Amino acid sequence: YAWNRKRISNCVADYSVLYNSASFSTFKCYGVSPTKLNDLCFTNVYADSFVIRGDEVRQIAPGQTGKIADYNYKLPDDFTGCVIAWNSNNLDSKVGGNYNYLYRLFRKSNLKPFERDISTEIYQAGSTPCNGVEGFNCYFPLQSYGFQPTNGVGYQPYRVVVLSFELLHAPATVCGPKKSTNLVKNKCVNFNFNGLTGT
Amino acid sequence: QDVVNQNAQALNTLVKQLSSNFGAISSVLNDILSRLDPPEAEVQIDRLIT
Amino acid sequence: QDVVNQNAQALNTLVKQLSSNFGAISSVLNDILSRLDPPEAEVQIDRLIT
């Protein structure tokens, strides 16, 4: 429910170090090809990381449905970026079960894409406004998970991060390790000015 | 004068048509070609072509 | 009379072309809009528009 938003800017990115770091569960990029990621210059690449259950990881896509995909995280329909998910058990194997996580069960209004669901306070489910007693027709939205090593392999905890860089918005700053070249004039040549390509 | 004006408007509209998405993710062939793999970029390129 | 007949007939055809699916699920925009969400109704509305 509380997903961080770590901005990145004014540096050089890479993708080659994100191929052999670990055999991730999924490295899937909507709107961009993951092989050409080190060729174009982006505009204020974002970063949002969290942990979810291994079977609902399918919910991370632009336009799906599911408890996380509805009440926790909403991607835009025109999402343009990569999602990287990898199984986190060796570092998240709690024999007693780690219950320091929370997600929503019911919300009055569903979230528009890219909205922090900070409404993490008491919630009302049905009739008889209960004023915070969680009785009948009042079910708490914030529920924990079942992450333990004895838990099902599809139900294991997983660490996910979504690189969501918007393109063609401002002077780009995040293009990778490509090397510059001298400037030549009065010849029909191929150029590349911060992604702006042509002849 | 109407002849010149009509031909100029026709050419202006034809050349301005080059800046519409028509459904694809962009309006520049080089962009789609440089940030998408061919087997996927075919659909965008084909929308632009049509 | 041929002029009037041809014009009325062309207009009748243009009108009646509003009730065909063109490949969509239904030939009414309100129906699709009230039966589907945008992210998967775009394709239907697009076939109708085309």
Curated annotation (Swiss-Prot), chain A:
Effect of residue 125 to V: Increased resistance to neutralizing antibodies
Disulfide pattern: 29-82, 41-175, 130-138
Chain intervals for the UniProt region annotation (Immunodominant HLA epitope recognized by the CD8+): 98-106
Receptor-binding motif, as annotated region: 87-158
Effect of residue 151 to Y: In strain: Alpha/B.1.1.7, Beta/B.1.351, Gamma/P.1, Theta/P.3, Mu/B.1.621, 19B/501Y, Omicron/BA.1, Omicron/BA.2, Omicron/BA.2.12.1, Omicron/BA.2.75, Omicron/BA.4, Omicron/BA.5, Omicron/BQ.1.1, Omicron/XBB.1.5, Omicron/EG.5.1; May enhance affinity to human ACE2 receptor
Effect of residue 67 to N: In strain: Beta/B.1.351, Omicron/BA.1, Omicron/BA.2, Omicron/BA.2.12.1, Omicron/BA.2.75, Omicron/BA.4, Omicron/BA.5, Omicron/BQ.1.1, Omicron/XBB.1.5, Omicron/EG.5.1; May enhance affinity to human ACE2 receptor
Region feature (Receptor-binding domain (RBD)): 1-191
Impact noted for substituting residue 148 to R: In strain: Omicron/BA.1, Omicron/BA.2, Omicron/BA.2.12.1, Omicron/BA.2.75, Omicron/BA.4, Omicron/BA.5, Omicron/BQ.1.1, Omicron/XBB.1.5, Omicron/EG.5.1
Region feature Disordered, mapped onto this chain: 105-140, 169-191
Effect of residue 95 to P: In strain: Omicron/XBB.1.5, Omicron/EG.5.1
Effect recorded for residue 197 to K: In strain: Omicron/BA.1
Result for mutant: residue 58 to S: In strain: Omicron/BA.2, Omicron/BA.2.12.1, Omicron/BA.2.75, Omicron/BA.4, Omicron/BA.5, Omicron/BQ.1.1, Omicron/XBB.1.5, Omicron/EG.5.1
Consequence when changing residue 18 to I: In strain: Omicron/XBB.1.5, Omicron/EG.5.1
Result after altering residue 110 to K: In strain: Omicron/BA.2.75, Omicron/BQ.1.1, Omicron/XBB.1.5, Omicron/EG.5.1
BetaCoV S1-CTD domain residues: 1-177
Effect of residue 94 to T: In strain: Omicron/BQ.1.1
Effect of residue 134 to K: In strain: Beta/B.1.351, Eta/B.1.525, Theta/P.3, Iota/B.1.526, B.1.1.318, Gamma/P.1, Zeta/P.2 and Mu/B.1.621; May enhance affinity to human ACE2 receptor
Region called Integrin-binding motif, residue ranges: 53-55
Quaternary structure and interacting proteins, as annotated: Binds to host ACE2. RBD also interacts with the N-linked glycan on 'Asn-90' of ACE2. Cleavage of S generates a polybasic C-terminal sequence on S1 that binds to host Neuropilin-1 (NRP1) and Neuropilin-2 (NRP2) receptors. Interacts with host integrin alpha-5/beta-1 (ITGA5:ITGB1) and with ACE2 in complex with integrin alpha-5/beta-1 (ITGA5:ITGB1). May interact via cytoplasmic c-terminus with M protein. May interact (via N-terminus) with host bilirubin and biliverdin, thereby preventing antibody binding to the SARS-CoV-2 spike NTD via an allosteric mechanism.
Biological role: Attaches the virion to the cell membrane by interacting with host receptor, initiating the infection. The major receptor is host ACE2. When S2/S2' has been cleaved, binding to the receptor triggers direct fusion at the cell membrane. When S2/S2' has not been cleaved, binding to the receptor results in internalization of the virus by endocytosis using host TFRC and GRM2 and leading to fusion of the virion membrane with the host endosomal membrane. Alternatively, may use NRP1/NRP2 and integrin as entry receptors.
Name this polypeptide is given: Spike protein S1
Region of the whole protein represented: 351 to 549 of 1273
